[PDB]
Amino acid sequence: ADYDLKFGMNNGTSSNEYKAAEMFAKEVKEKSQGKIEISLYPSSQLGDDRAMLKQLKDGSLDFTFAESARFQLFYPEAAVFALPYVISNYNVAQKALFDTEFGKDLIKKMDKDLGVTLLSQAYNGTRQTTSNRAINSIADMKGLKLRVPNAATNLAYAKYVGASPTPMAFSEVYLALQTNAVDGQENPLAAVQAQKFYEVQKFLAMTNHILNDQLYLVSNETYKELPEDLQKVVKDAAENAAKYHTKLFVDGEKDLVTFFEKQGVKITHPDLVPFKESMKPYYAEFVKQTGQKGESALKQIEAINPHH
Numbered sequence: 377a378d379y380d381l382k383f384g385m386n387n388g389t390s391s392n393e394y395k396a397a398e399m400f401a402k403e404v405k406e407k408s409q410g411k412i413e414i415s416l417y418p419s420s421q422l423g424d425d426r427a428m429l430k431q432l433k434d435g436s437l438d439f440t441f442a443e444s445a446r447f448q449l450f451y452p453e454a455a456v457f458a459l460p461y462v463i464s465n466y467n468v469a470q471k472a473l474f475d476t477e478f479g480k481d482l483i484k485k486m487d488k489d490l491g492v493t494l495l496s497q498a499y500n501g502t503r504q505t506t507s508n509r510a511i512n513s514i515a516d517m518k519g520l521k522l523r524v525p526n527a528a529t530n531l532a533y534a535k536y537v538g539a540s541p542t543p544m545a546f547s548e549v550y551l552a553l554q555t556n557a558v559d560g561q562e563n564p565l566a567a568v569q570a571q572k573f574y575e576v577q578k579f580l581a582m583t584n585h586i587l588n589d590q591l592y593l594v595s596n597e598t599y600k601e602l603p604e605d606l607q608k609v610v611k612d613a614a615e616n617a618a619k620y621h622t623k624l625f626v627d628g629e630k631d632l633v634t635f636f637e638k639q640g641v642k643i644t645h646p647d648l649v650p651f652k653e654s655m656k657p658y659y660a661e662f663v664k665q666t667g668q669k670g671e672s673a674l675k676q677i678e679a680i681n682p683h684h
């Protein structure tokens with residue numbers, strides 16, 4: 377094609393993210409009259425999200441996904457998006473990114489500093505905790521060998537609830553669980569399904585601890601080369617795909633508990649009051665480390681009403 381573009385993904389081929397990326401690619405090919413073709417590179421074949429964000433920066437990869445919270449790697453205050461239990465729901469995630477001074481500034485910095493244009497935002501689910509033994513209460517977290525991604529907010533979730541975290545890339549998790557090198561992991565329901573973690577985890581606890589969005593990102597080096605009509609094709613396709621993407625997650629949060637029960641998983645509902653209480657010293661540490669910018673981002677987010 378005139379523009380042979382590439383979309384790198386950490387997710388695998390059986391995921392919502394992949395389905396939405398397929399929709400995006402098909403729409404772009406059609407509405408560009410075949411001038412743009414977007415090939416898909418899932419399963420972290422190009423590296424993880426941190427790696428793929430670097431590839432968009434240097435222009436060697438055209439599209440990828442990232443969470444708003446992942447930008448805490450560059451702007452520590454952006455950890456606010458994944459401080460456990462701070463963002464209430466997707467409604468708050470959307471307004472936090474687009475409708476706060478903090479979020480509007482973050483989007484500008486991603487462009488100026490990091491070489492990426494934000495095309496759209498989707499919902500990527502609320503993280504829950506799977507394990508090889510029941511989590512009936514916060515006590516069951518104590519000493520649980522909990523795999524986390526290489527992200528400070530997930531490490532802190534594990535630490536503060538009393539678990540023993542082991543960081544590793546998404547691709548390594550299934551084997552870690554299978555072999556009982558670790559006892560559990562935490563991810564939205566849809567990822568537990570996509571990765572078949574349910575094959576290797578007998579229990580699922582509704583910890584409801586971190587809310588993931590998902591950003592459709594394009595390399596500035598690629599977006600600038602597209603004539604403006606093709607920029608619009610890409611943007612409009614990203615927005616259409618993000619709505620579809622969110623709906624896949626919303627619907628699965630209704631449908632997946634019955635799916636996991638049919639696969640033999642036992643679902644628990646621990647009292648979340650002590651989970652939330654346990655984060656109070658973490659929020660204090662966040663404010664100490666990130667200073668007024670962090671206090672301000674928290675204030676801006678805590679002001680958002682979660683009811684549509």
Ligand SMILES: O=C(CO)N[C@H]1[C@H]([C@H](O)[C@H](O)CO)O[C@](O)(C(=O)O)C[C@@H]1O
Pocket residue numbers: 386387424425441442443445446524525526527545546562563567590
């Ligand atoms: O790579 C991306 C891009 O948004 N997100 C990944 C996501 C992300 O890297 C973490 O939430 C940290 O921001 O981590 C996981 O949930 C995981 O490793 O458990 C996989 C998910 O695909």
